[PDB]
Protein backbone atom coordinates (compact mmCIF):
# COMPACT_ATOMS: atom_id res chain seq x y z
CA UNK A 1 0.00 0.00 0.00
CA UNK A 2 2.98 2.29 0.67
CA UNK A 3 6.36 1.82 -1.04
CA UNK A 4 8.74 4.40 0.39
CA UNK A 5 11.92 3.87 -1.64
CA UNK A 6 14.39 6.56 -0.54
CA UNK A 7 12.08 9.61 -0.58
CA UNK A 8 9.13 9.05 -2.91
CA UNK A 9 6.01 6.85 -2.78
CA UNK A 10 5.78 4.51 -5.78
CA UNK A 11 2.67 2.74 -4.48
CA UNK A 12 0.89 4.77 -7.19
CA UNK A 13 2.59 2.64 -9.90
CA UNK A 14 2.80 -1.00 -8.77
CA UNK A 15 0.73 -3.64 -10.54
CA UNK A 16 1.41 -6.17 -7.79
CA UNK A 17 3.70 -7.28 -4.98
CA UNK A 18 4.69 -10.85 -4.04
CA UNK A 19 6.36 -11.42 -0.67
CA UNK A 20 7.94 -14.88 -0.76
CA UNK A 21 10.21 -16.69 1.69
CA UNK A 22 11.58 -20.19 2.15
CA UNK A 23 12.78 -21.77 5.38
CA UNK A 24 16.19 -22.34 3.74
CA UNK A 25 15.94 -19.34 1.43
CA UNK A 26 18.68 -16.76 1.08
CA UNK A 27 16.51 -13.85 2.21
CA UNK A 28 12.99 -12.54 2.59
CA UNK A 29 12.10 -11.75 -1.01
CA UNK A 30 9.76 -9.06 -2.32
CA UNK A 31 9.16 -8.92 -6.08
CA UNK A 32 7.28 -5.72 -6.92
CA UNK A 33 6.27 -5.05 -10.53
CA UNK A 34 5.78 -1.46 -11.69
CA UNK A 35 4.69 0.50 -14.73
CA UNK A 36 7.39 3.01 -15.68
CA UNK A 37 6.00 6.16 -17.30
CA UNK A 38 7.88 9.48 -17.45
CA UNK A 39 7.09 10.15 -13.78
CA UNK A 40 8.66 6.96 -12.43
CA UNK A 41 11.42 7.11 -15.05
CA UNK A 42 12.52 10.52 -13.74
CA UNK A 43 13.52 9.27 -10.29
CA UNK A 44 15.75 6.63 -11.93
CA UNK A 45 15.41 3.64 -9.61
CA UNK A 46 18.78 1.86 -9.49
CA UNK A 47 19.91 -1.37 -7.88
CA UNK A 48 20.88 -0.82 -4.25
CA UNK A 49 17.93 1.46 -3.54
CA UNK A 50 16.21 0.88 -0.20
CA UNK A 51 12.56 -0.25 -0.40
CA UNK A 52 10.23 -0.22 2.61
CA UNK A 53 6.76 -1.71 2.14
CA UNK A 54 4.14 -0.51 4.63
CA UNK A 55 0.70 -2.10 4.90
CA UNK A 56 -2.07 -2.51 7.46
CA UNK A 57 -0.91 -5.37 9.67
CA UNK A 58 -3.33 -8.20 10.39
CA UNK A 59 -2.66 -8.19 14.15
CA UNK A 60 -3.52 -4.65 15.29
CA UNK A 61 -4.70 -3.10 11.98
CA UNK A 62 -1.99 -0.43 12.16
CA UNK A 63 0.40 0.53 9.37
CA UNK A 64 3.62 -1.38 10.05
CA UNK A 65 6.79 -1.96 8.04
CA UNK A 66 6.29 -5.53 6.83
CA UNK A 67 9.39 -5.43 4.59
CA UNK A 68 12.64 -3.47 4.84
CA UNK A 69 15.36 -4.40 2.35
CA UNK A 70 17.25 -3.30 -0.74
CA UNK A 71 16.56 -3.55 -4.47
CA UNK A 72 18.83 -6.37 -5.63
CA UNK A 73 17.95 -6.20 -9.33
CA UNK A 74 15.87 -4.09 -11.72
CA UNK A 75 14.62 -5.35 -15.10
CA UNK A 76 13.05 -2.83 -17.48
CA UNK A 77 10.96 -3.58 -20.55
CA UNK A 78 11.04 -0.94 -23.29
CA UNK A 79 8.20 -1.83 -25.68
CA UNK A 80 5.92 -1.96 -22.63
CA UNK A 81 7.33 0.39 -20.00
CA UNK A 82 7.01 -2.09 -17.13
CA UNK A 83 9.84 -1.84 -14.61
CA UNK A 84 10.08 -4.94 -12.42
CA UNK A 85 12.07 -5.18 -9.19
CA UNK A 86 13.17 -8.11 -7.04
CA UNK A 87 13.82 -6.75 -3.56
CA UNK A 88 15.88 -8.56 -0.93
CA UNK A 89 16.56 -7.93 2.72
CA UNK A 90 20.21 -7.50 3.59
CA UNK A 91 20.82 -11.22 4.35
CA UNK A 92 21.48 -11.47 0.60
CA UNK A 93 24.70 -9.55 1.28
CA UNK A 94 25.81 -12.25 3.71
CA UNK A 95 25.02 -14.99 1.17
CA UNK A 96 27.39 -13.40 -1.39
CA UNK A 97 30.35 -12.20 0.73
CA UNK A 98 32.76 -15.11 1.17
CA UNK A 99 35.25 -15.22 4.04
CA UNK A 100 37.39 -17.78 5.87
CA UNK A 101 37.23 -18.07 9.66
CA UNK A 102 38.78 -20.58 12.07
CA UNK A 103 36.71 -21.30 15.18
CA UNK A 104 37.45 -23.13 18.42
CA UNK A 105 34.77 -24.96 20.42
CA UNK A 106 31.91 -22.55 21.14
CA UNK A 107 28.20 -21.91 20.59
CA UNK A 108 26.38 -20.64 17.52
CA UNK A 109 25.34 -17.37 19.17
CA UNK A 110 28.96 -16.42 19.84
CA UNK A 111 29.90 -17.21 16.24
CA UNK A 112 27.02 -15.11 14.88
CA UNK A 113 28.02 -12.23 17.14
CA UNK A 114 31.61 -12.58 15.90
CA UNK A 115 30.47 -12.46 12.26
CA UNK A 116 28.33 -9.38 12.89
CA UNK A 117 31.13 -7.66 14.81
CA UNK A 118 33.67 -8.41 12.07
CA UNK A 119 31.44 -7.26 9.20
CA UNK A 120 29.66 -4.42 11.08
CA UNK A 121 26.15 -5.89 10.81
CA UNK A 122 23.61 -4.45 13.29
CA UNK A 123 21.94 -7.13 15.39
CA UNK A 124 19.43 -7.34 18.22
CA UNK A 125 20.09 -9.29 21.41
CA UNK A 126 20.76 -12.75 19.99
CA UNK A 127 19.07 -15.69 21.69
CA UNK A 128 21.40 -18.12 23.46
CA UNK A 129 21.16 -21.26 21.35
CA UNK A 130 23.00 -23.09 24.13
CA UNK A 131 24.44 -25.94 22.07
CA UNK A 132 28.24 -26.16 21.99
CA UNK A 133 29.79 -26.67 18.55
CA UNK A 134 33.00 -28.46 17.65
CA UNK A 135 36.04 -26.69 16.24
CA UNK A 136 35.80 -26.14 12.48
CA UNK A 137 37.32 -24.08 9.67
CA UNK A 138 34.86 -22.48 7.25
CA UNK A 139 35.18 -20.99 3.77
CA UNK A 140 31.62 -20.60 2.44
CA UNK A 141 29.51 -17.44 2.55
CA UNK A 142 28.72 -15.72 5.84
CA UNK A 143 25.10 -16.83 5.59
CA UNK A 144 26.46 -20.25 4.61
CA UNK A 145 28.59 -20.34 7.77
CA UNK A 146 25.65 -19.22 9.91
CA UNK A 147 23.40 -21.88 8.38
CA UNK A 148 26.08 -24.54 8.85
CA UNK A 149 26.57 -23.81 12.55
CA UNK A 150 22.80 -23.53 13.04
CA UNK A 151 22.39 -26.96 11.44
CA UNK A 152 25.08 -28.34 13.74
CA UNK A 153 23.20 -26.67 16.62
CA UNK A 154 19.92 -28.33 15.61
CA UNK A 155 21.94 -31.50 15.82
CA UNK A 156 23.01 -32.13 19.45
CA UNK A 157 19.50 -31.30 20.69
CA UNK A 158 19.51 -27.55 20.15
CA UNK A 159 16.39 -25.70 19.09
CA UNK A 160 15.78 -24.82 15.45
CA UNK A 161 16.90 -21.23 14.81
CA UNK A 162 16.63 -19.16 11.64
CA UNK A 163 18.22 -15.79 10.86
CA UNK A 164 16.10 -12.99 9.39
CA UNK A 165 17.29 -9.45 8.77
CA UNK A 166 14.59 -6.79 9.26
CA UNK A 167 16.38 -3.51 10.08
CA UNK A 168 18.94 -5.23 12.35
CA UNK A 169 19.86 -8.91 12.33
CA UNK A 170 17.60 -11.20 14.36
CA UNK A 171 18.06 -14.81 15.47
CA UNK A 172 14.52 -16.15 15.10
CA UNK A 173 13.59 -19.44 16.71
CA UNK A 174 11.06 -21.30 14.59
CA UNK A 175 8.24 -22.05 17.03
CA UNK A 176 8.15 -18.61 18.67
CA UNK A 177 5.75 -16.55 16.55
CA UNK A 178 3.43 -14.37 18.62
CA UNK A 179 0.11 -15.40 17.04
CA UNK A 180 -0.64 -18.99 16.01
CA UNK A 181 -3.00 -18.21 13.15
CA UNK A 182 -5.67 -20.71 12.09
CA UNK A 183 -5.89 -21.16 8.31
CA UNK A 184 -8.94 -23.46 8.22
CA UNK A 185 -11.36 -20.52 8.19
CA UNK A 186 -9.94 -19.09 4.92
CA UNK A 187 -8.92 -22.43 3.40
CA UNK A 188 -9.45 -21.97 -0.33
CA UNK A 189 -7.76 -25.31 -1.00
CA UNK A 190 -5.34 -27.64 0.79
CA UNK A 191 -3.13 -30.50 -0.43
CA UNK A 192 -2.27 -32.95 2.36
CA UNK A 193 0.73 -34.95 1.11
CA UNK A 194 2.21 -37.86 3.08
CA UNK A 195 5.16 -40.02 2.10
CA UNK A 196 8.13 -42.14 3.11
CA UNK A 197 10.29 -40.13 0.71
CA UNK A 198 12.72 -38.86 3.38
CA UNK A 199 11.78 -41.25 6.18
CA UNK A 200 14.61 -42.19 8.54
CA UNK A 201 13.98 -45.15 10.85
CA UNK A 202 17.59 -46.09 11.65
CA UNK A 203 20.98 -44.39 11.64
CA UNK A 204 24.38 -46.08 11.91
CA UNK A 205 26.83 -43.47 13.18
CA UNK A 206 30.46 -44.04 12.12
CA UNK A 207 32.50 -41.41 13.93
CA UNK A 208 35.40 -40.02 11.91
CA UNK A 209 36.78 -38.47 15.13
CA UNK A 210 37.34 -39.97 18.57
CA UNK A 211 35.67 -38.94 21.82
CA UNK A 212 35.75 -44.98 18.24
CA UNK A 213 32.16 -43.83 18.72
CA UNK A 214 29.95 -46.24 16.75
CA UNK A 215 26.33 -47.24 17.30
CA UNK A 216 22.84 -47.70 15.92
CA UNK A 217 19.71 -46.06 17.33
CA UNK A 218 16.78 -47.46 15.34
CA UNK A 219 13.55 -45.87 16.55
CA UNK A 220 10.55 -47.36 14.68
CA UNK A 221 12.11 -50.35 12.92
CA UNK A 222 9.14 -52.63 13.61
CA UNK A 223 6.56 -50.29 12.04
CA UNK A 224 8.01 -48.63 8.92
CA UNK A 225 10.93 -51.02 8.41
CA UNK A 226 14.63 -50.33 8.87
CA UNK A 227 14.91 -47.25 6.68
CA UNK A 228 18.56 -46.71 7.60
CA UNK A 229 21.02 -43.87 7.07
CA UNK A 230 24.70 -43.44 7.92
CA UNK A 231 25.86 -40.23 9.62
CA UNK A 232 29.63 -39.89 9.20
CA UNK A 233 30.33 -36.34 10.35
CA UNK A 234 33.60 -35.23 11.94
CA UNK A 235 31.67 -32.76 14.11
CA UNK A 236 30.19 -35.70 16.06
CA UNK A 237 33.06 -36.31 18.51
CA UNK A 238 31.02 -37.64 21.42
CA UNK A 239 28.63 -40.43 22.32
CA UNK A 240 25.90 -38.08 23.56
CA UNK A 241 26.41 -35.95 20.45
CA UNK A 242 25.93 -39.07 18.33
CA UNK A 243 22.76 -40.03 20.21
CA UNK A 244 21.29 -36.54 19.92
CA UNK A 245 22.17 -36.36 16.22
CA UNK A 246 20.43 -39.70 15.72
CA UNK A 247 17.39 -38.51 17.69
CA UNK A 248 17.33 -35.28 15.64
CA UNK A 249 17.04 -37.28 12.39
CA UNK A 250 14.18 -39.78 12.83
CA UNK A 251 10.91 -39.01 11.08
CA UNK A 252 7.95 -40.68 9.39
CA UNK A 253 8.86 -39.28 5.97
CA UNK A 254 7.63 -36.18 4.22
CA UNK A 255 4.41 -34.86 5.76
CA UNK A 256 3.41 -31.42 4.45
CA UNK A 257 0.31 -29.48 3.43
CA UNK A 258 0.23 -27.21 0.36
CA UNK A 259 -2.22 -24.68 1.78
CA UNK A 260 -3.91 -22.00 -0.34
CA UNK A 261 -5.58 -19.12 1.51
CA UNK A 262 -8.10 -16.65 0.07
CA UNK A 263 -6.97 -13.93 2.54
CA UNK A 264 -3.39 -12.75 2.99
CA UNK A 265 -2.28 -13.00 6.62
CA UNK A 266 0.26 -10.21 6.35
CA UNK A 267 2.67 -11.10 9.18
CA UNK A 268 3.27 -14.77 8.32
CA UNK A 269 6.90 -15.67 7.67
CA UNK A 270 9.04 -18.76 7.20
CA UNK A 271 9.41 -20.83 10.35
CA UNK A 272 6.30 -19.43 12.03
CA UNK A 273 4.01 -21.81 13.90
CA UNK A 274 0.57 -21.91 12.25
CA UNK A 275 -2.52 -24.08 12.73
CA UNK A 276 -4.61 -25.90 10.16
CA UNK A 277 -7.53 -27.83 11.65
CA UNK A 278 -6.66 -28.96 15.19
CA UNK A 279 -3.03 -29.70 14.32
CA UNK A 280 -0.12 -27.24 14.32
CA UNK A 281 2.55 -26.99 11.62
CA UNK A 282 5.65 -24.92 10.91
CA UNK A 283 5.75 -22.75 7.79
CA UNK A 284 8.25 -24.31 5.39
CA UNK A 285 7.43 -21.63 2.82
CA UNK A 286 5.07 -18.68 2.39
CA UNK A 287 4.24 -16.79 -0.82
CA UNK A 288 2.04 -13.73 -0.45
CA UNK A 289 0.83 -11.99 -3.61
CA UNK A 290 -0.58 -8.51 -2.96
CA UNK A 291 -2.52 -8.01 -6.16
CA UNK A 292 -5.78 -6.04 -6.13
CA UNK A 293 -7.16 -8.94 -4.05
CA UNK A 294 -4.70 -9.90 -1.28
CA UNK A 295 -3.92 -13.61 -1.39
CA UNK A 296 -1.56 -16.09 0.27
CA UNK A 297 -0.22 -19.58 -0.40
CA UNK A 298 1.59 -21.64 2.23
CA UNK A 299 3.61 -24.84 2.46
CA UNK A 300 3.71 -26.19 6.02
CA UNK A 301 5.09 -29.33 7.61
CA UNK A 302 5.79 -31.18 10.82
CA UNK A 303 8.78 -30.51 13.05
CA UNK A 304 10.38 -33.93 12.51
CA UNK A 305 10.43 -33.71 8.71
CA UNK A 306 11.73 -30.13 8.77
CA UNK A 307 14.51 -31.07 11.18
CA UNK A 308 15.42 -34.10 9.07
CA UNK A 309 15.49 -32.22 5.75
CA UNK A 310 16.56 -28.62 6.43
CA UNK A 311 18.73 -29.53 9.46
Amino acid sequence: KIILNGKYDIANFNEGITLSEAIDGVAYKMDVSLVEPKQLKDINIKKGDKIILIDIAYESKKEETIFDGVVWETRRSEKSKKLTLSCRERTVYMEESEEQYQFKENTATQRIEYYCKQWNIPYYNLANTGKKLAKVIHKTNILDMIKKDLKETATKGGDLFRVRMDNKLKLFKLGTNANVYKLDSILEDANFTSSFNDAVTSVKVLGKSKDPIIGTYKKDADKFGTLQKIKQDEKIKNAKEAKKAAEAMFNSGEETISVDCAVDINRIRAGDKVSLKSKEYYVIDVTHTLDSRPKMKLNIGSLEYIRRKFY
Binding site: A22, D24, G25, V26, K29
Partner: peptide
Protein backbone atom coordinates in the same frame (compact mmCIF):
# COMPACT_ATOMS: atom_id res chain seq x y z
CA UNK B 1 -3.35 -18.49 -29.73
CA UNK B 2 0.43 -18.80 -30.09
CA UNK B 3 1.65 -16.25 -27.51
CA UNK B 4 0.71 -18.65 -24.69
CA UNK B 5 3.82 -20.71 -25.50
CA UNK B 6 6.16 -17.72 -25.26
CA UNK B 7 4.43 -16.42 -22.13
CA UNK B 8 4.56 -19.70 -20.24
CA UNK B 9 8.05 -20.66 -21.39
CA UNK B 10 9.11 -17.31 -19.93
CA UNK B 11 7.22 -18.13 -16.72
CA UNK B 12 8.85 -21.57 -16.47
CA UNK B 13 12.34 -20.16 -17.06
CA UNK B 14 11.79 -17.33 -14.58
CA UNK B 15 10.35 -19.60 -11.90
CA UNK B 16 13.06 -22.25 -12.09
CA UNK B 17 15.88 -19.69 -12.26
CA UNK B 18 14.30 -17.82 -9.35
CA UNK B 19 14.05 -20.96 -7.21
CA UNK B 20 17.63 -22.01 -7.98
CA UNK B 21 18.95 -18.55 -7.12
CA UNK B 22 16.95 -18.41 -3.88
CA UNK B 23 17.77 -21.86 -2.51
CA UNK B 24 21.30 -21.94 -3.91
Amino acid sequence: KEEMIQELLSQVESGIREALQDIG
